[PDB]
Design a protein around this ligand. Sequence first.
Ligand code: CLA
Ligand code: CLA
Ligand code: CLA
Ligand code: CLA
Ligand SMILES: CC1=C[C@H](O)CC(C)(C)[C@H]1/C=C/C(C)=C/C=C/C(C)=C/C=C/C=C(C)/C=C/C=C(C)/C=C/C1=C(C)C[C@H](O)CC1(C)C
Ligand SMILES: CC1=C[C@H](O)CC(C)(C)[C@H]1/C=C/C(C)=C/C=C/C(C)=C/C=C/C=C(C)/C=C/C=C(C)/C=C/C1=C(C)C[C@H](O)CC1(C)C
Ligand SMILES: CC1=C[C@H](O)CC(C)(C)[C@H]1/C=C/C(C)=C/C=C/C(C)=C/C=C/C=C(C)/C=C/C=C(C)/C=C/C1=C(C)C[C@H](O)CC1(C)C
Ligand SMILES: CC1=C(/C=C/C(C)=C/C=C/C(C)=C\C=C\C=C(C)\C=C\C=C(C)\C=C\C2=C(C)C[C@H](O)CC2(C)C)C(C)(C)CCC1
Ligand SMILES: CC1=C(/C=C/C(C)=C/C=C/C(C)=C/C=C/C=C(C)/C=C/C=C(C)/C=C/C2=C(C)CCCC2(C)C)C(C)(C)CCC1
Ligand SMILES: CCCCCCCCCCCCO[C@@H]1O[C@H](CO)[C@@H](O[C@H]2O[C@H](CO)[C@@H](O)[C@H](O)[C@H]2O)[C@H](O)[C@H]1O
Lengths: 194, 194, 217, 74, 165, 73, 63
Amino acid sequence: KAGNWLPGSDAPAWLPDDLPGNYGFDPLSLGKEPASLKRFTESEVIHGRWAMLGVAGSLAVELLGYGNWYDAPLWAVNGGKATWFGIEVPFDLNALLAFEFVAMAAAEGQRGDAGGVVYPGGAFDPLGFAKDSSKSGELKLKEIKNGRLAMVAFLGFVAQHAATGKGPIAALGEHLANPWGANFATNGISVPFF
Amino acid sequence: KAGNWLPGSDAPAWLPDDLPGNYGFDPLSLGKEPASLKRFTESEVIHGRWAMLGVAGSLAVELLGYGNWYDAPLWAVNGGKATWFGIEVPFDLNALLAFEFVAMAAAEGQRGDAGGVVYPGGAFDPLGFAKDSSKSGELKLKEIKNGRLAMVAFLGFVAQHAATGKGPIAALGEHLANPWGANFATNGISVPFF
Amino acid sequence: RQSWLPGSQIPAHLDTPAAQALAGNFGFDPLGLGKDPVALRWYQQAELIHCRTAMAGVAGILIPGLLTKAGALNVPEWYDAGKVAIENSFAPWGSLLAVQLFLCGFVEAKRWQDIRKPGSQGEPGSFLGFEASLKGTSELGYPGGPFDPLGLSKEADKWADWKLKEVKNGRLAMLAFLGFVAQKYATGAGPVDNLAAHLKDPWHVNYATNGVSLPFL
Amino acid sequence: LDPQIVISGSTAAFLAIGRFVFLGYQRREANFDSNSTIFATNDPAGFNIIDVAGWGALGHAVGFAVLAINSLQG
Amino acid sequence: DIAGLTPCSESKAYAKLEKKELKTLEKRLKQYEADSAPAVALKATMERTKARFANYAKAGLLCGNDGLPHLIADPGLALKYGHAGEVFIPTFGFLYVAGYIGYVGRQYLIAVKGEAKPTDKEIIIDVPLATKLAWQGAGWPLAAVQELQRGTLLEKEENITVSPR
Amino acid sequence: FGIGHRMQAILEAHTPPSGSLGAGHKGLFDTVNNSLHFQLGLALASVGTITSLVAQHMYSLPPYAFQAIDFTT
Amino acid sequence: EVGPKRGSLVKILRPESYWFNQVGKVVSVDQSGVRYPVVVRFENQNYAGVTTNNYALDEVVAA
Ligand code: CLA
Ligand code: CLA
Ligand code: CLA
Ligand code: CLA
Ligand SMILES: CC1=C[C@H](O)CC(C)(C)[C@H]1/C=C/C(C)=C/C=C/C(C)=C/C=C/C=C(C)/C=C/C=C(C)/C=C/C1=C(C)C[C@H](O)CC1(C)C
Ligand SMILES: CC1=C[C@H](O)CC(C)(C)[C@H]1/C=C/C(C)=C/C=C/C(C)=C/C=C/C=C(C)/C=C/C=C(C)/C=C/C1=C(C)C[C@H](O)CC1(C)C
Ligand SMILES: CC1=C[C@H](O)CC(C)(C)[C@H]1/C=C/C(C)=C/C=C/C(C)=C/C=C/C=C(C)/C=C/C=C(C)/C=C/C1=C(C)C[C@H](O)CC1(C)C
Ligand SMILES: CC1=C(/C=C/C(C)=C/C=C/C(C)=C\C=C\C=C(C)\C=C\C=C(C)\C=C\C2=C(C)C[C@H](O)CC2(C)C)C(C)(C)CCC1
Ligand SMILES: CC1=C(/C=C/C(C)=C/C=C/C(C)=C/C=C/C=C(C)/C=C/C=C(C)/C=C/C2=C(C)CCCC2(C)C)C(C)(C)CCC1
Ligand SMILES: CCCCCCCCCCCCO[C@@H]1O[C@H](CO)[C@@H](O[C@H]2O[C@H](CO)[C@@H](O)[C@H](O)[C@H]2O)[C@H](O)[C@H]1O
C-alpha cells in the first residue's frame, strides 16, 4: 500500500493492495462494489489528469501575465478577441464550440469504445517510460498523487476566487504579504461568525 | 561510549557502544526502536553539519563588517541588491528561490536515494582524512560534538536576538564590557518578575 | 473503601475490579451514566482531559490574578484578558482560532484514534520515526515518551498516589472555573476581588447577599 | 451569419460523429435494448436511412439553435 | 430588520396598543373607589401590563405593522441578530424535557417487563421504582447516545411481528 | 425502425449496485403494462397535481384578458 | 420425541398467525402424524382473546 490515511486504522478489505495510491481512504464505502470500484479508478485517473492540465494552465496564464483563469473567457461575452500567448486567435466563440465539440466527441468516443482503458501506452507513450510493468507501479503512484493534489488545488482555486475575487497568484502574494491578516478566516465569506 | 551525561546513571540498552557521541542521553526514549534510531542518527549528523555551516557563516559575516545574520535578507524587503563580500549580485529574490529549490531538491534527492547514508566518502573526501576505519571513530566523535555545539550556538543566536535585538558579536562585546549589567537576566523577558 | 456518602449503596458498576482501578473511585454515580464499561472508559478519558484542561486554565487565571493583586504582575481579569490580548496582537481572533482549531484537531484526532485502538499510533513508517514514542502505556489516558520527560511515572510505588493527586486536584479545578463563571455573573468582579471582599466581612458578603443566588430572599 | 453554411456544417458534423464515432456505441446499445421492416443498406458500416434521419435531425436542431442564438445578438 | 420588521421599542403601533390597553383598564378603574379590592386588582393588572410591554421591548423582539411581536424560527437569523431566545433555546429546552419523559417511561417499561405480571405494574404504578428512574433520568441524552452506539436501543427485525403482506 | 428505447430495458438497467433498492425496477414494466389500475392511479396522481398547478398558476398569473378584475370568476 | 421439548420457548413462523415472530412456550407435541402437533401457549392474547394455538413442526423454531 501507499500508506495509511488514518494511522492505526484497519484498511478496507475491498481495496486491493496493488492499486496505485491505496491509502485505505474510503469511510463512506463507496468503492465497496467491485464494479463501482473499477469505474472509480479510471474516473479518478481521468479527473487527476484533467485537473493537472487545468491547474498548470491556470498557473501559467497568471505567471506569464495574461490574467487569471476566471477572466480568460471574458473576451467572448463583451466584444473581444481571444489571445493565446499574446497572439490574436482568428476564431470566434461559435467556431470554438464546433471544433471543441467535434474533437472532444471523437477522442472521448474512442476512449469510451476502448472499454475503460486506464493505461493505454503505445502511441501515448512515445518515450517508453513505462515499457516494463515492473517499474510502472511506482510511476503510477506519482501520477495519482499529483492528480489528487491538482484536484484539491483546482477546488481551492474556485473556492478562493468565489470568496475573494482574486487569482491564485494574487491571493498567494497577498497571503505572503500578510499571513495572519489575509487567509480564509479573514475574508468574511468562509466563516460567517469570525 | 563517549561518556555519561548524568553521572551515576546507567546507560540505556538501546544505544550501541560503537555509536559516535554516545553519552547515554535519552530520557524520553525516543530512539528506543532501531528503525527510529537510524533516521534520528542521520538527522542529527545532517543537523550538526548544517548548524556548523550556519554558525560559521553568521560569525564570519558579523566579524567582517557586513551586518549580522538577521539583517542579511533585509535587502529583499525594502528594495535592494544582495552583496557577497562587498560584491554586488544581480539575482533577485524570485530567481534565488527557484535556483536554490532546484539545486537543493536535486542534491537532497540524490542523498536520500542512497538509503540513508551518513558517511558516503569517496568524492566527498578527496583528501582521504578518513581512509582507515581505525581513526574514523575518533573523528566522527569530533564531528558530532562540534555539530551539537553548533546547534546549541545557533539556538542561542536566535534566542539572544529575539531577546535583545543585537547580533552575536555585538552581544559578546556588550557582555565583555559589562558582565553583571548585561546578561540574560537583564534583558527584561527571560526573568519576568525581575 | 472510601465513599462519597457514608451509608449509601455504592453502584455495582463502580465496585468491579476494573472500575476500582480508576483513580478517585468514591462510588459517586447517582444517575448511573457509567453502567456500561465502554461508556465508563470513554467518560474516564473525558474526565482526565477535563481535569488537565481545567487545572491549566484555573492556574492561568488564579496565579496571574494573585500576582496582579500584589506588585508582581499587571495581568487583567480573565473575563477581559481576551480583548486586551487581541488589541495589541498580530492576528485577529478568527484567524487565530482557525490555526488553533487545526493544530488542536490534529492531536485530538490522534488521541481519539488511540482511544479507539490503544497503541495504534505506533504504526511503523507513519510519523517520521516518532511513532515509536507515540504508543501510550498500559493505562489509557496515561502516555509516556515525549510526555512525562522527568520519568516520574516509572516508579509504581508512588504511581497509584500520583494519579490520585491528579484527578482530585483536577476535579477541584473543574469546580473553581465554574465558580469563576458564577461569581462573574453575580458580583461583576474577579475571583481575587471576591475572595478579599468575603475575607473583609464574611457574615455579610457572600452568595446569600448578592441578590442573585437567592431570588426568594 | 450564413444560414446555409451553419446548417450544412452542423448536419455534416453530426452525421460524421454518428457514422465514425458513436455508431459502434449506438449499435451496442440498440442490440442490448431487448413486426418490423429491415432497412438494409449497402453502407459498409450499416449506417442506414433511419440513422441518417436521426443524426440529420440532431444536426439541424443544433444548427438552428446556434443560428437563433447568433440572431439574438448576445 | 429581518423580513422588513421593526423593533418593538421603536414601533408606533406597539406603543399605541400599550396605550389602548392601559386606557381600557383605566376606564374600568374610573368607576370604583381608590382603596377597594377592584381598584387594587385593576392597578395590579395595569402594572403587569406595563411590565410586560417593557419586558417585551427590552428583550429585543421584532414587531410588525400590527405592533405585535414576531418570532424568528431560522437558526441563522436568530443567532446573527440576537433572536435565539425565541425559537432555538426553547427548542432545546423542550427536547430535553420531552426526551427526559420518554426515557424515564421506556426505562420503567423495560424494568417491569422482566417481572411476573408486567401488566399489573402498568396499571398499579410502582412508586419507588418510578421515582428512582425519574431521578436517574437527568442523564438521558448521554445514556441514549450510549444505548444507540452499543446497538441496544433498537430491536431486531426478526423479533418484531408484521402482517402477512 | 431499430432506433429508440425499450422501457423494459431502461427499467431493468436501473438498479443501484449496493443493493439499497433490492432488485431495483426489475419486472416493473410487466406489472405496469399488464395492470390498468396502476396506470389509472399514475394518471390520476399526475392529473390531480396538474389540476392544483393550474389553480395556483391561474390565480397568480392570469392568462386571460380582464380576468383579475373579475373577482367572482 | 419428535418436535421441540416440552416447556421450551419457540418462535412462530406462520405468516398469518397473530404471534408471528413472537416467542411462546411449548405445552405438548402430538406423537401421531397430525398436521399441527406442536401446542404453543403465549403470554399475550390475540384479538379473539385466545392464548394458545397449534403449529406444525416446520412452523416453529427454537428461539
Ligand atoms: C493544494 C492545496 C491548497 C493550498 C496550497 C492552498 C493555499 C492557499 N489558500 Mg486555499 N483552498 C483549498 C486548498 C489549498 N489552498 C481548498 C481545497 C479549498 C476549498 C475548501 C480552499 C479554499 C480557500 C479559500 C476560501 C481561501 C483560500 C486561500 C488560500 C491562501 C491563504 C491560506 C488559506 O487561508 O487557505 C486555507 C485553506 C484551507 C482551510 C483548506 C486547505 C486544504 C488542505 C488542508 C490543504 C491541502 C493539503 C496540504 C498541501 C497539506 C496539508 C497538511 C497539513 C494539514 C498538516 C493560500 C496561498 C485564501 C485566500 O484567498 O488568500 C487570501 C482564501 O480566502 N483557500
Ligand atoms: C534535532 C537534532 C537532533 C537529533 C535528530 C538528535 C538525535 C539523537 N541524539 Mg542528540 N543532541 C542534539 C540534537 C539532536 N540529536 C543537540 C543540539 C545536543 C546538544 C544539547 C544533543 C546531544 C546529545 C547527546 C549527549 C546524546 C544525543 C544522543 C542522540 C541519539 C539518541 C536517540 C534519541 O535520544 O532520540 C532522538 C532525538 C530526537 C528525535 C530529537 C527530538 C527533537 C526534540 C523535539 C527537541 C526539543 C527541544 C526544543 C524544541 C528546544 C527548542 C525550544 C523551543 C522553545 C523553540 C539520537 C540519534 C545520544 C547518543 O547516543 O548519541 C548518538 C546522546 O548521548 N544527543
Ligand atoms: C429546517 C430548514 C432550514 C431552512 C429552510 C433554512 C433556511 C435558511 N437558512 Mg438555515 N439552518 C438550519 C435549517 C434551515 N435553514 C439548521 C438546522 C441550522 C443549524 C445547523 C441552520 C443554520 C443556519 C446558519 C448559520 C445560517 C442559515 C442561513 C439560512 C438562510 C439562507 C441560507 C440557505 O438557504 O441555505 C441553507 C442553510 C444552511 C446550509 C446553513 C449554512 C448557511 C449557508 C452556508 C449560507 C450562509 C452564507 C451567507 C450567510 C448567506 C447570506 C449572505 C448575506 C445575505 C449575508 C435561509 C433562509 C444563513 C443566514 O441567512 O444567516 C442569517 C446562515 O448563515 N441557517
Ligand atoms: C413510555 C411512554 C411512551 C414513549 C417513550 C413513546 C414514544 C413514542 N411514541 Mg407513543 N404513546 C404513549 C406513550 C409513549 N410513547 C401513550 C401512553 C400513548 C397513548 C396516548 C401513545 C400513543 C402514540 C401514538 C398514536 C403515536 C405514538 C408515537 C411514538 C413515537 C414518536 C414520538 C412521539 O412522541 O409521538 C407521540 C406520543 C404521544 C403523543 C403520547 C405520549 C404520551 C405520554 C407523554 C407518555 C408518558 C407515558 C407514561 C405515563 C410515563 C411513564 C410513567 C412511568 C415512569 C410509571 C415514539 C417512539 C407515534 C408513532 O407511531 O411513531 C412513529 C404515534 O403515531 N405514541
Ligand atoms: C475519495 C472519497 C471516498 C470517500 O468514501 C467519500 C469522500 C470523502 C466523499 C471521497 C472524497 C472525494 C473528493 C475529495 C472528491 C473531490 C474531487 C475533486 C476536487 C475533483 C476535481 C476535479 C477538477 C477538475 C477535473 C478540473 C479541471 C480543470 C480544468 C479542465 C480547467 C480548465 C481551464 C483552464 C485551464 C483555465 C481557463 O482559464 C479556464 C478553464 C477552461 C476552465
Ligand atoms: C536528544 C534528545 C532526545 C531526548 O530523549 C529528549 C530531548 C531532550 C528532547 C533531546 C534533545 C533535543 C535537542 C537539544 C534538540 C535541539 C536541536 C537543535 C538546537 C537543532 C538546531 C539546528 C540548527 C540548525 C540546523 C541551524 C542552521 C543554520 C543555518 C542553516 C543558518 C543559515 C543562515 C546563515 C548562514 C546566516 C544568514 O544570515 C541567514 C541564514 C541563511 C539563515
Ligand atoms: C459526576 C457526575 C455523574 C453523576 O451521575 C451526575 C452528575 C452530578 C451530573 C455528575 C457531576 C458532574 C459535574 C459536577 C460536572 C462538572 C464538570 C465541570 C464543572 C467541568 C468544567 C471544566 C472546566 C474547564 C475545562 C475549564 C477550563 C478553563 C480554561 C481553559 C480557561 C481559560 C482561560 C484562561 C486561562 C484565562 C483567559 O483570560 C480566559 C480563558 C481563555 C477563559
Ligand atoms: C432518545 C429518545 C427516543 C428516540 C428517538 C429517536 C429514535 C429518534 C430518531 C430519529 C431519526 C431516525 C431520524 C431523525 C431525523 C431528524 C431530522 C431530519 C430533523 C432535522 C432538523 C431540522 C431540518 C431543523 C430543525 C430546526 C432547529 C434545529 C431549531 C428550530 O427548531 C427551528 C428548526 C425547525 C429550523 C426514545 C427512545 C423514544 C426515548 C426518549 C428520547
Ligand atoms: C452516400 C455516400 C456519402 C454520403 C452523402 C450524403 C450527402 C449524405 C447525406 C445526407 C443528408 C444531407 C441528410 C440531411 C438530413 C436532414 C434531416 C434528417 C433533417 C431534419 C429536420 C428536423 C428534425 C428539423 C426540425 C426543426 C424544425 C422543422 C423547425 C425549427 C426547429 C427544428 C430545427 C427542430 C459520402 C459522399 C459521404 C461517401 C460516399 C457514399
Ligand atoms: C463542462 C462541459 C464539459 C463536460 C462535458 C460532459 C459531456 C458528457 C457526455 C457523455 C457522453 C456519453 O458518451 C458515451 O458514454 C458511454 C458510457 O460511458 C460510452 O460507452 C462506453 O462505456 C460503457 C460503459 O462504461 C460501455 O457499456 C460501452 O459499450 C462503451 O462504449 C460511449 O463510448 C460514449 O459515447
